[PDB]
Amino acid sequence: RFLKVKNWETDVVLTDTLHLKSTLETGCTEHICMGSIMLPTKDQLFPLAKEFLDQYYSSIKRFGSKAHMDRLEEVNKEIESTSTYQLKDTELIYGAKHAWRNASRCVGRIQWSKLQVFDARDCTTAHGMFNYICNHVKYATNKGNLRSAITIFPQRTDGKHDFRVWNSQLIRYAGYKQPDGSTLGDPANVQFTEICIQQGWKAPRGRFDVLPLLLQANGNDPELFQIPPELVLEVPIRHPKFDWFKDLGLKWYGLPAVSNMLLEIGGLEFSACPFSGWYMGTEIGVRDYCDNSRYNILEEVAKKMDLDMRKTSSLWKDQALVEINIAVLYSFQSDKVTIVDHHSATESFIKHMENEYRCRGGCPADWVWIVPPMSGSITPVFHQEMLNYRLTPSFEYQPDPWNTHVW
Amino acid sequence: RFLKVKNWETDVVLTDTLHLKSTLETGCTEHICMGSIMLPVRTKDQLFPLAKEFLDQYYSSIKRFGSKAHMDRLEEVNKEIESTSTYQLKDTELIYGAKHAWRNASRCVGRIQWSKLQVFDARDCTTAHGMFNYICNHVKYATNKGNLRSAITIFPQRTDGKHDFRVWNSQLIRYAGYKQPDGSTLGDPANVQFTEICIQQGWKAPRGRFDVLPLLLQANGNDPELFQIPPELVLEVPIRHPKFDWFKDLGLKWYGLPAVSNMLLEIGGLEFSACPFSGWYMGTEIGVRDYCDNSRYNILEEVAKKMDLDMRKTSSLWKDQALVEINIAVLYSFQSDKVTIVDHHSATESFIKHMENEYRCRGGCPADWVWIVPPMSGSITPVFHQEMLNYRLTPSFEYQPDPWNTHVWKG
Numbered sequence: 001r002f003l004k005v006k007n008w009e010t011d012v013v014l015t016d017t018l019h020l021k022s023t024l025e026t027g028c029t030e031h032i033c034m035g036s037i038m039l040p041t042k043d044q045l046f047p048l049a050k051e052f053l054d055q056y057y058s059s060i061k062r063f064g065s066k067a068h069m070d071r072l073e074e075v076n077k078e079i080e081s082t083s084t085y086q087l088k089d090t091e092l093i094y095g096a097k098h099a100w101r102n103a104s105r106c107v108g109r110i111q112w113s114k115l116q117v118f119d120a121r122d123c124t125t126a127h128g129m130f131n132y133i134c135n136h137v138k139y140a141t142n143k144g145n146l147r148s149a150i151t152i153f154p155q156r157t158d159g160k161h162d163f164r165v166w167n168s169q170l171i172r173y174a175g176y177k178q179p180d181g182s183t184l185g186d187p188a189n190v191q192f193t194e195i196c197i198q199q200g201w202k203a204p205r206g207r208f209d210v211l212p213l214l215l216q217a218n219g220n221d222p223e224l225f226q227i228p229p230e231l232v233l234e235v236p237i238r239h240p241k242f243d244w245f246k247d248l249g250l251k252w253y254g255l256p257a258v259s260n261m262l263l264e265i266g267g268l269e270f271s272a273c274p275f276s277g278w279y280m281g282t283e284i285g286v287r288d289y290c291d292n293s294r295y296n297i298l299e300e301v302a303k304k305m306d307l308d309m310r311k312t313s314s315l316w317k318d319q320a321l322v323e324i325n326i327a328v329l330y331s332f333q334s335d336k337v338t339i340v341d342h343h344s345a346t347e348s349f350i351k352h353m354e355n356e357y358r359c360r361g362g363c364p365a366d367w368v369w370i371v372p373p374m375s376g377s378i379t380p381v382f383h384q385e386m387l388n389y390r391l392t393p394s395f396e397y398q399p400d401p402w403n404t405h406v407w
Numbered sequence: 408r409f410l411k412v413k414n415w416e417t418d419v420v421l422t423d424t425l426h427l428k429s430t431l432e433t434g435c436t437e438h439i440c441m442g443s444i445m446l447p448v449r450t451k452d453q454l455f456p457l458a459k460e461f462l463d464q465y466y467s468s469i470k471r472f473g474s475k476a477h478m479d480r481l482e483e484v485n486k487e488i489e490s491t492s493t494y495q496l497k498d499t500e501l502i503y504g505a506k507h508a509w510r511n512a513s514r515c516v517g518r519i520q521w522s523k524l525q526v527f528d529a530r531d532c533t534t535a536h537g538m539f540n541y542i543c544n545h546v547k548y549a550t551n552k553g554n555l556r557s558a559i560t561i562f563p564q565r566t567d568g569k570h571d572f573r574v575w576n577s578q579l580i581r582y583a584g585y586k587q588p589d590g591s592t593l594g595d596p597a598n599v600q601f602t603e604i605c606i607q608q609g610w611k612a613p614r615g616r617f618d619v620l621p622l623l624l625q626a627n628g629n630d631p632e633l634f635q636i637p638p639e640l641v642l643e644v645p646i647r648h649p650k651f652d653w654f655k656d657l658g659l660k661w662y663g664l665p666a667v668s669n670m671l672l673e674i675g676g677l678e679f680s681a682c683p684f685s686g687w688y689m690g691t692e693i694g695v696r697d698y699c700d701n702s703r704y705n706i707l708e709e710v711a712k713k714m715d716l717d718m719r720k721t722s723s724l725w726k727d728q729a730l731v732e733i734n735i736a737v738l739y740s741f742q743s744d745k746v747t748i749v750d751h752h753s754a755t756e757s758f759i760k761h762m763e764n765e766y767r768c769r770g771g772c773p774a775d776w777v778w779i780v781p782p783m784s785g786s787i788t789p790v791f792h793q794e795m796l797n798y799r800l801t802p803s804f805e806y807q808p809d810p811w812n813t814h815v816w817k818g
């Protein structure tokens with residue numbers, strides 16, 4: 001019932017008790033582990049609210065105080081009467097910070113308590129959503145000195161009046177399938193790019209076109225807005241040694257801003273809750289640039305490096321991979337845009353895990369996502385056993401809205 | 408019930424029904440996943456059903472399920488269990504069992520090869536000297552002058568648990584490790600404890616960086632005995648780099664034959680506590696883990712020094728750069744010396760083809776993503792993007808505790 005996790009590099013053993021508070025299900029059973037699968041009423045609401053308010057009042061050292069009992073009382077009355085309830089500002093902020101704290105797939109959580117929370121619960125239209133999102137983008141970007149932020153739109157009611165950002169991230173590059181059957185831009189975004197055109201966007205038809213936002217307020221059909229280009233900090237990618245590198249014409253944006261997740265706090269569901277931090281270099285250099293179904297540039301860089309591409313065993317892909325990732329880090333650093341390398345991020349995460357074991361009794365962590373997509377075993381997380389379990393408040397993945405929306 | 412897995416690079420989707428035949432436990436529950444945890448005397452009451460399940464699988468594989476031969480064998484085994492409290496496997500069953508334990512080994516990326524396994528039946532073995540001879544023969548056969556052949560040698564099964572056969576070595580061939588008074592380690596830090604046991608047992612240690620360890624062999628529950636593998640049988644490869652001529656002067660070498668000797672083979676409920684098996688290396692095993700783990704030979708600093716990389720910030724990716732060069736050197740060296748090795752790109756591509764084939768012909772392929780994905784360049788290999796289901800099938804290979812923790816010394 002009390003569980004041990006061992007680091008095989010250091011012999012450090014931590015004991016996990018926090019998992020015993022978990023409530024939701026993993027996908028795993030006693031007979032099958034689904035650890036590598038990407039996606040494995042009034043009655044229901046009150047225990048959820050109580051569970052949350054108990055943890056909140058506990059956190060401010062006021063558990064079992066009159067203010068605790070009174071708030072439990074007030075929320076209970078509000079639920080029975082209105083079928084839902086509203087979080088106090090203090091509770092919203094606590095809940096959002098804890099959803100990040102509990103995100104078992106996030107290597108960046110040492111930072112969890114420094115989150116700027118923008119309360120957008122007074123929002124009523126897509127133009128309003130656009131305004132709030134621009135302000136978030138500008139605040140978060142901070143001229144390259146990135147600051148973590150979340151913007152929280154109104155909570156779900158009957159489920160027919162959802163706020164949604166249709167974009168999967170606030171800032172991404174367009175994808176277009178061309179006459180010769182290939183893809184221009186980001187193949188990840190071809191479907192979304194066409195939906196944007198279908199709704200009216202005028203695509204400049206390039207390789208790195210910042211997509212428009214497609215915003216859904218109150219269950220209405222979504223509307224298009226172009227983010228002010230001056231608000232989108234992009235970085236040209238050069239290499240500190242290879243001068244030909246710039247000729248590839250690659251760039252990436254500074255602000256990673258996930259916008260398709262659902263924030264659950266105390267049983268309430270915030271279906272539009274765009275959040276942002278800063279990049280770990282491998283997200284761009286390994287995944288965005290080198291996945292075969294993404295920009296898929298390994299073959300081009302390797303040719304420019306004059307590597308023996310005839311046999312897999314020359315490790316040409318691996319050599320190019322490293323150089324591509326040196327370039328990303330160098331470029332962001334040169335342009336003073338916050339970025340973190342995978343060695344640094346993972347070392348922070350080990351320090352974070354130790355803090356969480358010490359101060360909280362554990363840290364839910366998904367090793368499959370935490371270990372970086374290159375150089376796994378030379379980062380300390382590779383050797384670190386992790387227990388994965390689901391705590392609330394949480395961020396949950398939700399279906400792309402186009403499969404859901406009726407026009 | 409049916410379970411689907413998706414490859415996110417190709418959108419290929421597979422359907423797993425094989426998991427329904429699984430009975431053993433994973434360590435996970437609906438409330439916790441233990442997928443990254445390394446480690447998450449039988450009665451007759453237990454033995455009959457396990458024997459039956461196995462013989463049913465065996466007889467199905469040969470297209471004789473329900474035959475007289477099948478029924479007679481069930482009866483024979485049943486009688487033998489109630490009469491002697493155990494039973495003996497037929498040769499054909501032992502072979503089938505060993506091949507299936509490899510086929511079922513969810514941590515093994517090399518399983519496309521599972522049906523080509525040479526099984527050496529050593530169940531007539533009685534002494535440690537006998538074990539030595541069988542292991543020498545295995546090493547010579549498997550090595551095949553660099554043209555490596557997969558093999559397993561199977562010693563007598565467990566009886567009362569007081570008479571176990573065990574190879575105390577974790578692999579047949581490994582290098583000694585020596586903790587120095589100043590706290591540094593000479594040779595392989597992974598093997599310091601075992602090296603100390605060997606020395607205590609009377610091994611004369613050369614005390615170099617790459618001393619092949621003696622075998623420490625326990626037969627029939629007796630105290631283990633030391634043997635030196637004839638050096639002419641131990642194929643090694645000096646490591647050099649195709650472009651960097653200074654690489655050879657690092658003084659590195661490795662052995663060609665990866666031969667796991669500490670696992671327990673379970674077949675039809677019988678336990679084979681000594682079952683050394685061998686294949687060939689994937690390059691990263693040596694170049695990534697053995698050479699670059701901080702707790703192993705830990706050569707990244709020195710290699711990076713000689714490469715004159717910028718070592719003042721981790722963000723120069725000096726570690727990543729040196730890592731790749733070292734792995735080039737390992738593959739080049741083995742290839743140049745005509746010793747079998749496979750790079751991690753080729754091995755993972757083959758594993759995907761194996762896995763899909765297994766889904767079609769068998770209804771699934773249990774696979775542990777945490778182990779299958781290589782320890783460098785993960786996402787540029789196809790297995791990174793492949794959803795896998797992990798579950799336990801028997802016959803199986805299982806971890807067992809090191810024998811020095813459990814052994815009753817006879818003195």
Ligand code: HEM
Nearest residue numbers: 100103105106107108111148149275276277278279280395
């Ligand atoms: C401050 C810098 C941060 C860094 C360096 C960072 C790092 C990362 C990385 C590398 C991933 C893996 C994503 C992928 O492979 O696509 C990730 C996932 C995630 N992080 Fe962060 N993180 C940061 C901030 C945040 C913030 C501010 C939140 C929310 C407030 C957050 C919540 C998440 C969640 C929910 C996931 C899983 C996403 C999914 O399932 O698609 N992280 N983090």
Ligand code: HEM
Nearest residue numbers: 509512514515516517520557558684685686687688689804
């Ligand atoms: C023929 C070439 C083979 C290759 C290239 C190969 C590759 C590998 C690799 C890379 C691992 C992970 C090793 C590690 O990270 O330490 C592994 C694990 C394993 N393989 Fe193989 N394999 C081969 C043959 C075999 C054979 C012949 C058997 C048994 C008959 C076997 C059974 C296993 C088992 C049980 C594990 C898990 C080891 C453990 O838990 O400690 N494999 N394989």
Ligand SMILES: Cc1cc(N)nc(C[C@@H]2CNC[C@@H]2OCCCCCc2ccccn2)c1
Nearest residue numbers: 038039256257258276277278279280283397
């Ligand atoms: C099917 C699916 C499920 C899921 N949970 N998430 C995704 C999104 C995929 C998973 N990895 C790549 C892509 O997500 C990219 C967006 C994540 C950026 C995360 C981030 C947030 C903050 C700071 C740095 N990085 C897809």
Ligand SMILES: Cc1cc(N)nc(C[C@@H]2CNC[C@@H]2OCCCCCc2ccccn2)c1
Nearest residue numbers: 445446665666667685686687688689692806
């Ligand atoms: C705690 C623990 C559990 C376990 N199941 N296995 C181990 C042994 C570890 C796993 N990785 C490092 C060490 O194993 C080294 C031997 C692996 C050789 C595998 C092999 C066999 C055949 C061909 C190629 N490779 C340790």
Ligand SMILES: C[C@H](O)[C@H](O)[C@H]1CNc2nc(N)[nH]c(=O)c2N1
Nearest residue numbers: 036037038368369791792793794
């Ligand atoms: C199938 C497998 O779960 C999938 O490819 C995962 C592996 N690990 C990952 N890890 C991170 N950080 N991000 C990802 O998108 C993935 N993809």
Ligand SMILES: C[C@H](O)[C@H](O)[C@H]1CNc2nc(N)[nH]c(=O)c2N1
Nearest residue numbers: 382383384385443444445777778
């Ligand atoms: C803690 C974690 O499970 C552990 O370090 C694992 C990770 N994946 C691995 N994968 C392989 N092939 N071999 C290993 O030893 C490990 N070690």
Ligand SMILES: [Zn+2]
Nearest residue numbers: 028033435440
């Ligand atoms: Zn699991």
